[PDB]
Amino acid sequence: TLTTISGHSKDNLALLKCLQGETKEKEFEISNVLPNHKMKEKLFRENKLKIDIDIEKDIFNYSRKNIQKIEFMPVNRLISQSEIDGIIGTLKEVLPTGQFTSGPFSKKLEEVIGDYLNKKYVIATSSGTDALMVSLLSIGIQPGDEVIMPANSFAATENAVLAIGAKPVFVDIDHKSYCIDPLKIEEAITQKTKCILPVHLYGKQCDMKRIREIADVYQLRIIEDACQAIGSSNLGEYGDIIILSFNPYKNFGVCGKAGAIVTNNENLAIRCNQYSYHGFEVDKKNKKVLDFGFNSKIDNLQAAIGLERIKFLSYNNLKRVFLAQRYIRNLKELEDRELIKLPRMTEDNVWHLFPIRIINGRRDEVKNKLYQLYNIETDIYYPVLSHKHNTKLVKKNYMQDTLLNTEQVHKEILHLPLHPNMLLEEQNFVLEGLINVNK
């Protein structure tokens, strides 16, 4: 059997299983798409998998290095010297053009992302938050319309809804994946509902087939917040619009803010292009066709940087899967002792963040002791749920919201350090602290 590695999550899992010998005798080709550039250089030779790959020594550079502390996300570790060298090279080409607003690198990155997501239209934006705002306007959202969404996403998700005067309507999450529960969506639909905004939180996809079945009964649009899920196989199959972020701390990021709007719907894509640049007709600066818009296209310079950094995406995603598997397998004893709950390995997760649940009310004690006793930073993405801020909006509108699963899980969740440039010695340091703090 010969498989072409596409650079998405499903084929990364198949490749990992082959590298670890959990596989039938299988052979691999690599697709020559830009998100596979680093993987092809590092792991392939003459379009075949290198025979002498050792994951720990060659991909993770394991050398028994001594580790004394762990930070959750040291941002200097998220960019490699290889990426820097390439970024300097492409900046030497972009800077003399003087093209610093739109330009040819913006168009090229839109084509690359369209090819990678298998979608016809891409509008590269100045942020994922801006992409969401523009996408909501493009489907016709007016002030007062309702948008069904979960209450456990980053603030940007609700903020894009609120900034255009729409109303978040919060629905509880499921019991297995941190994602909006499809079985609770229909009961929140009102005559003001215009959109369902699922979030593919932590890099895991929501159950989109069920959500689309509901949307189609009520003639609702679906805008997917995929800002943490780049690379996830079949992303967007059922969505009207998919939102990406290329923030520098995402699985793929530029060196500043950026994002994208992805869709097969030409009418929505046109309206997104118009709203993302002042309401002007496409390529007609200063001539409005829509009533207003924003200044929200990507910078050409960041698109050039993105075309260099995206070369590392499938390889960095593979490294993330390996780290996730290694946490799951080495922490299983704590789950058998009913002290924690672990995520499961699935083919869609791109492992932007690695959640566990500490049950029996011990999450705060374990988090605090990991730091104070073991010098391990962990974090809680995110520390306050949407309906629990001390804002006038919440106090006037969301005081009767009860989201029982969301609120219970929020007492238990903890995120462990997971970023592709981590050393396995560093993950071992986290693993030993987690074991010791739970003896």
- Residues interacting with Na ion, by CB under 5 A? 52, 54, 58, 193
Before 382, cis peptide (omega within 30)? yes
Residues 127-186 touching a copy of itself, rule: CB under 8 A, are 127-130, 143, 154-156, 158-159, 162-165
**How many other C-beta atoms lie within 10 A of the C-beta of residue 254?**
27
- Going through 336-419 in order, the beta strands assigned E by DSSP cover 340-341, 354-358, 413-416
Q: Which does 25 bind (CB under 5 to 8 A by kind): a copy of itself, Na ion, none?
A: a copy of itself
Shortest approach of a copy of itself to residue 142 CB, angstroms? 10
Give the max Cα distance, the chain. 68
State the Cα–Cα distance between residues 200 and 231, nearest whole angstrom: 12
Closer CB to a copy of itself, 371 or 382, in the complex: 382
State the Cα–Cα distance between residues 336 and 338, nearest whole angstrom: 5
Pick the closest to residue 207 from 228, 189, 180 (CA basis): 180
Choices 113-121, 179-187, 243-251, 367-375; region in contact with a copy of itself by CB under 8 A = 243-251
State the Cα–Cα distance between residues 399 and 414, nearest whole angstrom: 26
Q: Decide: is 278 part of the binding site for a copy of itself (CB under 8 A).
A: yes
Q: Which does 79 bind (CB under 5 to 8 A by kind): Na ion, a copy of itself, none?
A: a copy of itself
Q: List residues with catalytic annotation.
A: 250
Q: Decide: is 79 part of the binding site for a copy of itself (CB under 8 A).
A: yes
Residues 92-131 touching a copy of itself, rule: CB under 8 A, are 92, 95-101, 126-130
Member of 8, 257, 271, 387 binding a copy of itself (CB under 8 A): 257
Member of 118, 423, 428, 432 binding a copy of itself (CB under 8 A): 423
Residues 359-378 touching a copy of itself, rule: CB under 8 A, are none
Shortest approach of Na ion to residue 278 CB, angstroms? 28
State the Cα–Cα distance between residues 24 and 137, nearest whole angstrom: 49
Pick the closest to residue 199 from 219, 227, 171 (CA basis): 227
Residues linked to residue 28 through DSSP beta bridges, in sequence order? 3
Member of 248, 355, 417, 433 binding a copy of itself (CB under 8 A): 248
Q: Decide: is 428 part of the binding site for a copy of itself (CB under 8 A).
A: no
**How many other C-beta atoms lie within 10 A of the C-beta of residue 248?**
18
Shortest approach of Na ion to residue 114 CB, angstroms? 29
Shortest approach of Na ion to residue 312 CB, angstroms? 14
State the Cα–Cα distance between residues 370 and 416, nearest whole angstrom: 11
